[PDB]
Amino acid sequence: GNARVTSGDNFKHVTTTGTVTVILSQALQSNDHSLLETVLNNRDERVIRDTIFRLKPALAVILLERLAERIARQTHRQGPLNVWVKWCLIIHGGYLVSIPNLMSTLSSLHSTLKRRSDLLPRLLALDARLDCTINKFKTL
Amino acid sequence: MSLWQLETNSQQFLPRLNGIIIDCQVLGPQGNYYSLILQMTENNSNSDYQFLLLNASDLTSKLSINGPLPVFNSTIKHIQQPISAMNTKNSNSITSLNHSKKKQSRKLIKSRRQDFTTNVEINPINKNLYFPHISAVQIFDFYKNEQVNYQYLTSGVNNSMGKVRFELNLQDPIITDLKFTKDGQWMITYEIEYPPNDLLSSKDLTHILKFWTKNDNETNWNLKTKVINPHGISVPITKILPSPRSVNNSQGCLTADNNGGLKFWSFDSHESNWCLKKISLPNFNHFSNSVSLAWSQDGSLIFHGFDDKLQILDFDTFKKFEVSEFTLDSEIQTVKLINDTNLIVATRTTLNAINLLRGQVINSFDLYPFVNGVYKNGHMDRLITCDERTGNIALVINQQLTDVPTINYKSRIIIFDSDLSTKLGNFTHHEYISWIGWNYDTDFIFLDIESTLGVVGTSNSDIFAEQLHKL
Amino acid sequence: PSLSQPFRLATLPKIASLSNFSLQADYVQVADGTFNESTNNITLGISGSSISQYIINPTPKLTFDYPIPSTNIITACNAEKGQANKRNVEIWAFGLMVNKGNYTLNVITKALFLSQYKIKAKAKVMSIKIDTKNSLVIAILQNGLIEIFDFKLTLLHSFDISYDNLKYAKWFTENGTEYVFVLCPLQDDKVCYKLLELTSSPIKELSSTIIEGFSFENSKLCYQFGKLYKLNQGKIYIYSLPHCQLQQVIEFPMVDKLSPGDDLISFQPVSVNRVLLTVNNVIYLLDLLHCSTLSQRELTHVKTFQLLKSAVINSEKSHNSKTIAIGISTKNGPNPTSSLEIINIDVGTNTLKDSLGKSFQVVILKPLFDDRVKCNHCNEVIEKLSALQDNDITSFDDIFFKELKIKEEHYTEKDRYISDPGFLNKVLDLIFGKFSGNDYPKTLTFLLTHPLFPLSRTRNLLSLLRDQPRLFKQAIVTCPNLPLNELLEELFSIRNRELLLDISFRILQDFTRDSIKQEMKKLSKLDVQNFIEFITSQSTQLFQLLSLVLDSIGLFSLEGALLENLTLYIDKQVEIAERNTELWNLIDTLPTYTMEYLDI
Amino acid sequence: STARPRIITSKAPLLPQQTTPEQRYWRQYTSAQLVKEHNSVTHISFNPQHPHDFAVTSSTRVQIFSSRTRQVIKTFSRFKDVVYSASFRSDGKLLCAGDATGLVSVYDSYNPRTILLSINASTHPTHVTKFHTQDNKILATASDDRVTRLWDISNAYEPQLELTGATDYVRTLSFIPAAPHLVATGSYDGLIRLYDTRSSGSTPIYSLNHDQPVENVIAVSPTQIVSCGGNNFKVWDLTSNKKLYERGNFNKAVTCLDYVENFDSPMQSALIASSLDGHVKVFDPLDNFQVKFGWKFSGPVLSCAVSPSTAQGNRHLVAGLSSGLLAIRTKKKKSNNFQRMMRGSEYQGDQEHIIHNDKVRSQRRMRAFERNINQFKWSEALDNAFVPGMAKELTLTVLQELRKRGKVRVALYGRDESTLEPLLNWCLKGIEDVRSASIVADWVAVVLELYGNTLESSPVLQELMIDLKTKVRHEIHKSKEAQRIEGMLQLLT
RNA sequence: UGCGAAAGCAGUUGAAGACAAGUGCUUGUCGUUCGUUAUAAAUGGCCUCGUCAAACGGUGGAGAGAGUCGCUAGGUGAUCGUCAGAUCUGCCUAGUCUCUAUACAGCGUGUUUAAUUGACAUGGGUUGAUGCGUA
């Protein structure tokens, strides 16, 4: 019927010019998705570091939630958005340590990452089988 | 069931019958009724016959009769699977029958693990008796001694089709645990789905946890939430303990793995679904299927026995109380609190009563002579039962032998007061008792491997009136 | 739960009646209306001095005092705030008795003296209750007469319980209705218990019962939430209203040692199923449901402390666990001085959590059955072992194994009888004393494999066993509850590769990652640095142990040059790990014209 | 015998940001019409009565739009200067408007030619003109004179009452429901002032401090009032005279605010609040005034309104922009001889002793793949999976069912390169998704183990494994990467 | 088969008798016994009672579809080629941008927490099966 399916990893209820920090902060506070998307369109890694560097630590936690939602719904954005996530943890790591709760507020990230990592052993098995069969017909 | 019309060689069908048809017969002067015998070959532990009387006019069940359908851990007595074209898990080939008989008799005699214990549940609101049949639950009324319902609780090829030949090697999802909240408005079920053979994903079991509801007037349980892979991937839920009335009005439960992890789930009105409220890390690298779990009535403290260590966990912080650790001689099979003061812990060698207030053992009884390797880990839990007012009960089953062990068994029930100081009663039943549990009244019900549920508890007118009735 | 340091309220006057410390409490009366959880005022009646009202916080202070002649004794006192014919007023009622000749019932009204009235009471006034809603004053007399008065002391109604020599009267409220129960001693240790309802007559008798075996002379009595608690000869008897039926008897052994006559005891309630008990200068917080001592405090600077009253928390309804109690403290010295002191009381959450392991009440394997089925002396042995000479290994092993009929040098399931903890502990002490240096008996090897090895001897065990490699290895593999601290320091101190892996396996199996991480933080930055160096130079359990170290080391501590070498090492492992995974999976896994030669 | 179970569609564990019952309702305001006006649309109001037309004030004119037609049906251009309100009375017969000149004109709604009453409230501009909800005869006017006069329709020469005490422009006026005597005004002082008309008046009973200039004051319930000013909106309780909640999720200064209750939505009550940042957002008072939906517009939104509770027809959401644009979003709501011959069909057995019903309810029509599985057509069921315009989730079920039935090799025997490519094409896309990755591995493993020989001789299949090898290697990098972010995340905690 | 965790760790799968076929010998079988913890394949697949249209309420969604040479990041091809680059105003993937009946999937609206109605004489006969539509 209309039951809610879920999983056991859902801990939800437990320096340079061109920085867009001003636009990012406004988009996060007001939850303006369209304004946020324009900020996320930037792909120059030098900008990404600098914007997050000047971004207030409190707003960073909300940014991690948003990226986790975009990554989870759209798998093709997993690549370009990981650099955003990787810098958020790098720069505001000290702040993220001194916060009362992580699992409840970052439940989306934990669920999203857990889904991908769990597929790894099966993907390697497919890789070995594909590599074996591909080699046989190439050499022949 | 196929009715072959021999005049034109045609055939009419009655499919999705509850079991394979052992016997058919046309019963009546005009063939009004058909009498059928159904087998329910899913349960390999026993031969579950069901007698069906159909009205031939519209092929509707006029009368369906069967007893309780418990699933025992291992095959009992001389149960033989029916003959099929091939030898499978649910059948025997032509040749395999005799060797299977001999092997089963030899297993019953020579081997030492003689576990036939079965899981059963009692509905607090209705006092109906729930039997987790394979992939389905039987609701059976022991007051009226009739079945009230048969419901499928899992996905799988259950009644979509009748499995034949290689399809008969498939395994439907197995309902491992089934429990009720104290209120009785919620049913918690735990299931293991087995992948088919000859695939890459042919060794990764799937563990599913489900929460169902129903109103008291209704008869069918409705799935309200489903959790796929609780606790992680390929990690079983070894124990389920519904929460006491104090905490969340009995709308919560605890689940425990073989890695020592605990998870507390609760029903949230805002969400309208069950949510994982609390978690404990199964992070250390230890595996053990012998885990037990108890909860104090006030709900303040939880007792989690993992392998040979009992841990006292505060519920509020969901961690050890700040002695918390009790070491036991061997693995804990059972932990229960007869009363808030006294905690009774059964290990693989003995049974002890420890007073929490003093933290000292009052009584210790030897179990090793009777329980050495007979039962797998976790079944002494379903052999020991505990009342909330008067006392607990120990059930010991032992083989009779006269000049090598014989198939026939004898069981003994011992009533023990709180702290095991004295034996209120000692009784002997002449046959293996699979399960004993405490009805929410004073009496205790027990199940016997013959599917018998016993209970242990405290003038001219006058001549005319006759004549007119005869006519 | 905790007991706070008493703070002084006022110093009692030096009057002859108050000089008897044993009877001092009876001469001080505490008003029921003014002393509760929320009130910051206490109205106190000190016989022969005055009736005074004190503010508690922020600093104790005297707000009002009514002088009384020194020859008078206060028998009952109560004060309540309300509205009278409308002005907010505070009604004070106090009943005084002069040399047994005349008894005075006095009511005073104050504006928040508006009026003062006085009448002669027929007998001693034992209890006074003020009903501000009806503008009534109700007094219970020692002769059994319950007289209802207005604020002008005009007698409105009088009711007789038909019994004299009343000794106890207590007012309580249930479901908005006023009730009072009284106890009258009878002959032969008998007591007539009467429960009265306050509503043509305003007083209705609900229950009357005669209780046998109820003595007053050596009994301390108090009531709380429908339960009457009587302390006598070290046993607390619990009686339940409305019929006052004996429910439970609780023995309190710490009072059983008290000699009769010298030890001053007071007993008052503080919350549901929790009471305050004082013995001389020691104050006890007790939980009567779980029979546990929640807290104890000794007042070394006073000879005795006598509880007068306590503000009681209905913890079932109140989230507040902090209250106060008032008592009389007497100082040590040739010229003892008595002072009124208040104690702040943390009572707790009323859960089994608070009472765990705090009992005030201070094994041999038994056959399951006394009497054709398929089968699946501790002290003496210690004495024999104790009689042996020092360093006699063969005799010590022979006596232990032979007497106990132990067949193996390691514990088995057939030694369940020997699992008595006391016997094991005594043997361990003998092994240490008898043997020292480089030679230990085989019995120690057996004990180390015993699941119930005492926790007391786990600490420094590895330090004892460091000399002998075999015995050290045995403790790592099987000795139960080896504390993590010694395992970790041995992990970073031992250079033996084999012991490192075995120690790593033991640490991971028996301890959680969150637990282990805290200790690794304590370890020196050099020791972890050396450990990392070995790694660069089952293996997963070592690598998993390394991952824990990096978390313990944290972000700031790690150094770039070392991180580079660690980074290069792990990259090599990942490539090797991927290579082996690929191998592991592999292990799991016509022409139109043809020319041929015929075979003929 | 039991009816055949229906095949259960595959549902993976829930992902973040699932659709909510509140969102599913508000997405239905689909049809968007953008009308362009000559100046900023300052105020928008809905007729309380059927057909619930709404009036927009812009520049020097007031226009009434038909609800069904969504077009202008009446125009009021008699005003010489700017117009600052078009509120209707509770009866809906009259609409009052204010002017920059200070003149208040009351017209008959749906008769722009007739003017019933003209009041010179003050010499300064009159920005607010609202009929009293409880009492029809009395009309309230607030002007830049900072006095909010209470007029009577009968006596238009002098005000009934002149409420004063505001030290700045009063641009907001509210009547508390169930309290006809109480009147609330909000000035740019930041103070919301409550007055009692039953008493002498002209002095507020009390003032509530908003700390920013108040742009609109609305009474959601008899005891609560919500006031929007500055960058947030706060809800006050009159009984307690203290703010219960505050929501400041907006970026620009909130301008207009409207409240609708007891309409057919899942939410019993809704609060819409324009932002001046292009946003109009919905809050639910039953859940602590938490945001539940939003719209974005081209420019700052000066006015918003939603169709009343009893709209009785298609609902409307109207937004007013300073550019002069008006945005409308709408949620749309034989012979007599033959009959006498066949006449009993209408009867439902109301007068009969026994009523017997055996008709089985009509089940939903099954799809082709389900019919094939039911009829044991394993190979044809696989073919139906990979057809154009087939739902991705619906394709995953048939693959899972065949695996569950144990028919994975059986479905793959009678196949060649021509009929294997559709499965491999989907596998090329299904490998990317986390839900269908594991199932793709099982099916691709069998086809390789079952068609190794055909692979060598068939070129087109070969490229399907080269590119499939490329993608699975890509997924490996993503799954390895997700483990690394997992590892560092454990370090932080 | 035993133990255990699910991973796995150890260990088995023997002899006699009778029958059939082929040529005393060979092979295969067992509604035969003793002992040990111990491929399949006889063309052979699951009934009927009522369908269709339009709504409504929760549950999910990779959204179902169409554009925008508007931006961002990649990959890559034909021909020529002074290797710098040219014409195809090249192509494809992903994100973003604009829009629509949320347009997509599923369960229910016999009472449920919530949520429905309407159409049809549920027949017989004739023609078309080279049916009808489309390239």
Swiss-Prot record, chain A:
Residues of the signal peptide: none
WD repeat ranges per the UniProt record: 54-94
Superkingdom of this protein's organism: Eukaryota
Compartments in which it is found: Nucleus, Nucleolus
Misc. comment: Present with 33100 molecules/cell in log phase SD medium.
Functional description taken from the UniProt entry: Involved in nucleolar processing of pre-18S ribosomal RNA. Required for optimal pre-ribosomal RNA transcription by RNA polymerase I together with a subset of U3 proteins required for transcription (t-UTPs).
Family: Belongs to the UTP5 family.
Oligomer status and interactors: Interacts with snoRNA U3. Interacts with MPP10. Component of the ribosomal small subunit (SSU) processome composed of at least 40 protein subunits and snoRNA U3. In the absence of snoRNA3, forms a complex with other t-UTPs. This complex can associate with pre-18S ribosomal RNAs.
Protein name: U3 small nucleolar RNA-associated protein 5
Species in which this protein is naturally found: Saccharomyces cerevisiae (strain ATCC 204508 / S288c)
UniProtKB/Swiss-Prot annotation, chain B:
Main location group: nucleus
Name assigned to this protein: NET1-associated nuclear protein 1
Keyword match rRNA processing: yes
Keywords attached to this entry: Nucleus, Repeat, Ribonucleoprotein, Ribosome biogenesis, rRNA processing, Transcription, WD repeat
Biological source species: Saccharomyces cerevisiae (strain ATCC 204508 / S288c) (Baker's yeast)
WD repeat residue intervals: 170-222, 232-275, 285-322
GO MF annotations in UniProt: mRNA binding; RNA binding; U3 snoRNA binding
A cellular component term, taken from the record's GO annotations: nucleoplasm
Portion of the full-length sequence here: 321 to 829 of 896
Compartment(s) where it occurs, according to its Swiss-Prot or TrEMBL record: Nucleus, Nucleolus
Other comments on record: Present with 6560 molecules/cell in log phase SD medium.
Function: Involved in nucleolar processing of pre-18S ribosomal RNA. Required for optimal pre-ribosomal RNA transcription by RNA polymerase I together with a subset of U3 proteins required for transcription (t-UTPs).
Tree of life domain: Eukaryota
Subunit: Interacts with snoRNA U3. Interacts with MPP10. Component of the ribosomal small subunit (SSU) processome composed of at least 40 protein subunits and snoRNA U3. In the absence of snoRNA3, forms a complex with other t-UTPs. This complex can associate with pre-18S ribosomal RNAs.
Gene Ontology biological-process annotations: maturation of SSU-rRNA; maturation of SSU-rRNA from tricistronic rRNA transcript (SSU-rRNA, 5.8S rRNA, LSU-rRNA); positive regulation of rRNA processing; positive regulation of transcription by RNA polymerase I
TM spans (from-to): none
Curated annotation (Swiss-Prot), chain C:
One GO CC term on file: 90S preribosome
Domain of life: Eukaryota
This protein's UniProt keywords: Nucleus, Phosphoprotein, Ribonucleoprotein, Ribosome biogenesis, rRNA processing, Transcription
A Pfam family that the UniProt record links to this protein: Utp8_C
Function: Involved in nucleolar processing of pre-18S ribosomal RNA. Also has a role in nuclear tRNA export. It acts between the steps of tRNA maturation/aminoacylation and its subsequent translocation out of the nucleus. Required for optimal pre-ribosomal RNA transcription by RNA polymerase I together with a subset of U3 proteins required for transcription (t-UTPs).
Quaternary structure and partners: Interacts with snoRNA U3. Interacts with MPP10 and UTP25. Component of the ribosomal small subunit (SSU) processome composed of at least 40 protein subunits and snoRNA U3. In the absence of snoRNA3, forms a complex with other t-UTPs. This complex can associate with pre-18S ribosomal RNAs.
Annotated source species: Saccharomyces cerevisiae (strain ATCC 204508 / S288c)
Biological processes, Gene Ontology terms: maturation of SSU-rRNA; maturation of SSU-rRNA from tricistronic rRNA transcript (SSU-rRNA, 5.8S rRNA, LSU-rRNA); positive regulation of transcription by RNA polymerase I; tRNA export from nucleus
Additional comment: Present with 16800 molecules/cell in log phase SD medium.
The protein's name: U3 small nucleolar RNA-associated protein 8
GO MF terms, alphabetically ordered: tRNA binding; U3 snoRNA binding
Cellular compartments annotated: Nucleus, Nucleolus
From Swiss-Prot, chain D:
Keyword list, A-Z: Nucleus, Repeat, Ribonucleoprotein, Ribosome biogenesis, rRNA processing, Transcription, WD repeat
Domain of life according to the entry: Eukaryota
Keyword Ribonucleoprotein belongs to the record: yes
Annotated TM spans: none
Any GO BP: positive regulation of transcription by RNA polymerase I
Protein localization: Nucleus, Nucleolus
Protein name (record): U3 small nucleolar RNA-associated protein 15
InterPro entries with a match to the protein in the record: U3_snoRNA-assocProt_15_C, WD40/YVTN_repeat-like_dom_sf, WD40_repeat_CS, WD40_repeat_dom_sf, WD40_rpt
Keyword S-adenosyl-L-methionine: no
Organism the protein comes from: Saccharomyces cerevisiae (strain ATCC 204508 / S288c) (Baker's yeast)
PANTHER family: U3 SMALL NUCLEOLAR RNA-ASSOCIATED PROTEIN 15 HOMOLOG, UTP15 U3 SMALL NUCLEOLAR RNA-ASSOCIATED PROTEIN 15 FAMILY MEMBER
High-level lineage: Eukaryota, Fungi, Dikarya, Ascomycota, Saccharomycotina
Described function: Involved in nucleolar processing of pre-18S ribosomal RNA. Required for optimal pre-ribosomal RNA transcription by RNA polymerase I together with a subset of U3 proteins required for transcription (t-UTPs).
